[PDB]
Design an enzyme around this catalytic site. Structure first.
Site, mmCIF file in Angstrom:
data_model
loop_
_atom_site.group_PDB
_atom_site.id
_atom_site.type_symbol
_atom_site.label_atom_id
_atom_site.label_comp_id
_atom_site.label_asym_id
_atom_site.label_seq_id
_atom_site.Cartn_x
_atom_site.Cartn_y
_atom_site.Cartn_z
ATOM 1 C CB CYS A 222 -4.216 -13.272 -0.181
ATOM 2 S SG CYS A 222 -3.403 -11.747 0.362
ATOM 3 C CG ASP B 179 -5.793 -6.907 -2.030
ATOM 4 O OD1 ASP B 179 -5.370 -8.069 -2.199
ATOM 5 O OD2 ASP B 179 -5.668 -6.281 -0.960
ATOM 6 C CB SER C 298 -19.097 -7.465 -1.041
ATOM 7 O OG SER C 298 -19.081 -7.886 -2.390
ATOM 8 C CG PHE D 74 -11.772 -7.190 -4.829
ATOM 9 C CD1 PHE D 74 -11.524 -6.870 -6.162
ATOM 10 C CD2 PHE D 74 -12.597 -8.272 -4.538
ATOM 11 C CE1 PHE D 74 -12.082 -7.617 -7.195
ATOM 12 C CE2 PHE D 74 -13.166 -9.030 -5.566
ATOM 13 C CZ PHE D 74 -12.907 -8.704 -6.898
ATOM 14 C CG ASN E 67 -20.467 -8.974 -7.751
ATOM 15 O OD1 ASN E 67 -19.490 -9.515 -7.232
ATOM 16 N ND2 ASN E 67 -20.968 -9.363 -8.920
ATOM 17 C CB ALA E 68 -15.549 -6.379 -7.953
ATOM 18 N NE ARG F 221 -2.463 -1.432 3.534
ATOM 19 C CZ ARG F 221 -2.725 -2.604 4.118
ATOM 20 N NH1 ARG F 221 -3.602 -3.452 3.608
ATOM 21 N NH2 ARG F 221 -2.095 -2.934 5.230
HETATM 22 N N1 LIG Z 1 -17.620 -10.718 -5.010
HETATM 23 C C1 LIG Z 1 -17.020 -9.570 -4.501
HETATM 24 N N2 LIG Z 1 -17.119 -8.382 -5.145
HETATM 25 C C2 LIG Z 1 -16.543 -7.270 -4.655
HETATM 26 N N3 LIG Z 1 -15.842 -7.288 -3.508
HETATM 27 C C3 LIG Z 1 -15.686 -8.431 -2.796
HETATM 28 C C4 LIG Z 1 -16.284 -9.632 -3.279
HETATM 29 N N4 LIG Z 1 -15.988 -10.613 -2.404
HETATM 30 C C5 LIG Z 1 -15.263 -10.125 -1.434
HETATM 31 N N5 LIG Z 1 -15.044 -8.777 -1.625
HETATM 32 C C6 LIG Z 1 -14.259 -7.874 -0.747
HETATM 33 O O1 LIG Z 1 -12.851 -7.989 -1.079
HETATM 34 C C7 LIG Z 1 -12.082 -7.559 0.058
HETATM 35 C C8 LIG Z 1 -10.784 -8.363 0.140
HETATM 36 S S1 LIG Z 1 -9.709 -7.690 1.447
HETATM 37 C C9 LIG Z 1 -9.150 -6.141 0.714
HETATM 38 C C10 LIG Z 1 -7.868 -5.716 1.421
HETATM 39 C C11 LIG Z 1 -7.704 -4.185 1.368
HETATM 40 N N6 LIG Z 1 -7.338 -3.756 -0.002
HETATM 41 C C12 LIG Z 1 -6.623 -3.773 2.351
HETATM 42 O O2 LIG Z 1 -5.489 -3.586 1.947
HETATM 43 O O3 LIG Z 1 -6.911 -3.627 3.674
HETATM 44 C C13 LIG Z 1 -12.959 -7.742 1.316
HETATM 45 O O4 LIG Z 1 -13.118 -6.504 2.023
HETATM 46 C C14 LIG Z 1 -14.293 -8.306 0.751
HETATM 47 O O5 LIG Z 1 -15.445 -7.813 1.455
#
Ligand SMILES: Nc1ncnc2c1ncn2[C@@H]1O[C@H](CSCC[C@H](N)C(=O)O)[C@@H](O)[C@H]1O
Ligand SMILES: Nc1ncnc2c1ncn2[C@@H]1O[C@H](CSCC[C@H](N)C(=O)O)[C@@H](O)[C@H]1O
Lengths: 376, 376
Positions: free
Chosen positions: B320, B280, B233, B211, B259-260, B196
């Site tokens: 991850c 991510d 989400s 995400f 939803n991405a 980051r």
């Molecule tokens: N289908 C989906 N569409 C969009 N977002 C989603 C998803 N499934 C999970 N996520 C989101 O993706 C994230 C992954 S963790 C993200 C980490 C953040 N960038 C950091 O550095 O702190 C979670 O917050 C989760 O709620």
């Protein structure tokens, strides 16, 4: 003139890889030069073309341009540009100005050794443009050497020679690499420039720089290690080392001519143990057939260096061959640390510096692997 | 008591991997705890043992020690030590204190959220040593929370709960990550801490952090981008984002629940185009069976983000999961940039930060992949 290619070659260029081999070409100009590529009447790219080679097409633009030669010399401008900002913030260091395909300038390589450029054309269309290439280099160089003796130029239907293209080019020159300086014969592996700088963060008693050439790694290591022992085959190389050594005011840098494969397994028997070992061998493989044998060579040397390390020591191992892919390279190091029954923690995994660009869609631009492990 | 294993399991421990599964075990103690491992009458290691699980042996030492419990609590000291130097040079940041196998402390994870530690035991032998673990943490923490609710603890024959092990642990707390701060619910992905920070070097108009969770990436990007649009989400997540946003004095950080997979393909049609996109996502795969489907999920989202970028934009993509190996992850990104007919230059390839150690001989300690590309 237009270059026509089949459906396979068309897909390669659409996936953004820059090469199209002869078997995927349908029709093409009678002579080498810069022509547009089509799949039927659908424009795919501009490219450097050679009708007498297996590697027929080398894309340098994926969009039509008014002047194909202008577009090319344009890529060269944007490629010299990406450097400059650094060329003026360290006008004495050694940097690559043009990294062929990686800069969208296929078959062209141009290195900067603190003011003195060295051009290297390996694609037929470039040969006639060497004067324009040199023009873009003057605003930064004190001279320009054309080192066109590469045996690879023969496949292109090009003569093998070497000679100035601007000003007067010395016989040699010193380069300022961080906190040290070295000499070049107008010799220098700019790829490992930033990985040699990385090595300055380590301290310890004894360090063994294997496959060192002019001692690029040794000079940086001498700053933090009691003793450093640069090793190599070419006595001419180790000499440039002692010379680079005194030139820095370093006495703790003894050289040692020998064959690393014998010198290492030997040092293990005599009970020699170090605090840091650097391994930076050459390809060990010219063709896809050497991969098998090369793998063993790389493995042995790494297995051996690992055994020479003390509990807690650092191992910096690398590979520059295009036949030793990254997953293979790392598999080998794991195979070595395994057989050695030693557990290596990963310190850092690095690759090629910014001035030696890599294109995802074109794998052959990625050859350098550099890893640092701590034995436990 | 002694643990006996076959020739296969013996070789695993000699190659320095730390796990020996049940089918490679011959004889072992009646109850979970810390016992030595042998291959006949040849000592191999000390380890955390559970007779009721497929993963029976977890080595934490490959040499005999007078006291097996002392050796363990010793690894914990050397593991807390490797941090401290950093814990006092930035007592407000979020760092991992113990990364299980990577620190030779199997089944134990202990995170530091600026003074407030959070321990997490997932191997039966640890459960009874939670008081000693906490003792080593006081010289650095203001409290210690035992978050032992992991569904994984059930396989070990352990109860699921959560509660303090020292001092009073707040409901939340702020962490100083570089030039920004965020909140944690005693929530935080310390793995991407240094990635980051990397993102702060980029400038541009619009940035789309997909995400994003609490907007860790967005906070850093807001410092150099006109607008930033954190997406996720869980509405509860984006909320923590707005909160982290104002807490920094950032107004240019609008959130967006959705939803991405739908939001991206949509933004491509509406003609939305950005200067930088960060991806991510989470595992997308719990088991070796999801690998196939997961691959497509990762590919789509990357293919989509690539299409949303302007010529010259940056793509920061990550993974991850332990089911998405590095070569696969990079293959997928190339498959995406390929289908997208866009050429991506490699800016940088990073992995896990120093406080989340990786062991070469033990692959499962390596799960984080982070890459930065520039579209051309
Ligand atoms: N289908 C989906 N569409 C969009 N977002 C989603 C998803 N499934 C999970 N996520 C989101 O993706 C994230 C992954 S963790 C993200 C980490 C953040 N960038 C950091 O550095 O702190 C979670 O917050 C989760 O709620
Ligand atoms: N069989 C062998 N044993 C030992 N050294 C060898 C060898 N074959 C090649 N070498 C040496 O390995 C070197 C590889 S180049 C070394 C690069 C140097 N570390 C730098 O950063 O500038 C060459 O100098 C070559 O002479």
């Amino acid at each position: 003139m237009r270059i026509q290619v089949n459906a396979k070659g068309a897909a390669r260029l659409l996936s953004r890889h820059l090469w199209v081999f002869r078997r995927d070409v349908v029709s093409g100009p009678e002579t080498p030069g810069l022509y547009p590529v089509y799949w039927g009447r659908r424009f795919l790219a501009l490219a450097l073309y050679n009708p007498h080679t297996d590697l027929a097409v080398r894309a340098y633009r994926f969009a039509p341009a008014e002047d194909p030669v202008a577009a090319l010399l344009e890529n060269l401008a944007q490629a010299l540009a990406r450097r400059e900002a650094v060329l003026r913030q360290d006008p004495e260091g050694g940097y690559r100005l043009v990294h062929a395909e990686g800069d969208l300038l296929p078959g062209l390589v141009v290195d900067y050794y603190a003011g003195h450029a060295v051009v290297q054309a390996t694609a037929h269309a470039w040969e006639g443009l060497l004067p324009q290439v040199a023009e873009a280099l003057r605003p930064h160089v004190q001279s320009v050497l054309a080192k066109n003796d590469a045996r690879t130029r023969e496949l292109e239907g090009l003569p093998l020679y070497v000679r100035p293209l601007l000003g007067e080019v010395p016989e040699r020159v010193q380069v300022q690499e961080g906190r040290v300086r070295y000499l070049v014969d107008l010799g220098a592996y700019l790829d490992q420039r930033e990985n040699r700088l990385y090595m300055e963060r380590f301290r310890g008693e004894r360090a063994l720089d294997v496959f060192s050439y002019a001692g690029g790694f040794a000079l940086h290591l001498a700053l933090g290690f009691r003793e450093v022992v640069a090793v190599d085959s070419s006595a001419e190389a180790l000499r440039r080392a002692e010379e680079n050594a005194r030139l820095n005011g370093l006495g703790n840098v003894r050289v040692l001519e020998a064959n690393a494969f014998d010198l290492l397994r030997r040092l293990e028997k005599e009970g020699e143990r170090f605090d840091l070992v650097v391994l930076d061998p050459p390809a060990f493989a010219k063709g896809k057939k050497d991969v098998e044998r090369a793998y063993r060579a790389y493995k042995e040397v790494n297995l051996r260096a690992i055994k020479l390390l003390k509990e807690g020591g650092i191992l910096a191992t690398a590979s520059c061959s295009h036949h030793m892919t990254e997953p293979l390279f790392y598999a080998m190091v794991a195979e070595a640390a395994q057989d050695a029954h030693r557990l290596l923690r990963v310190v850092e995994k690095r690759g090629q510096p910014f001035d030696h660009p890599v294109l995802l869609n074109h794998p052959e631009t990625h050859y350098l692997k550099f890893a640092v492990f701590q034995v436990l």
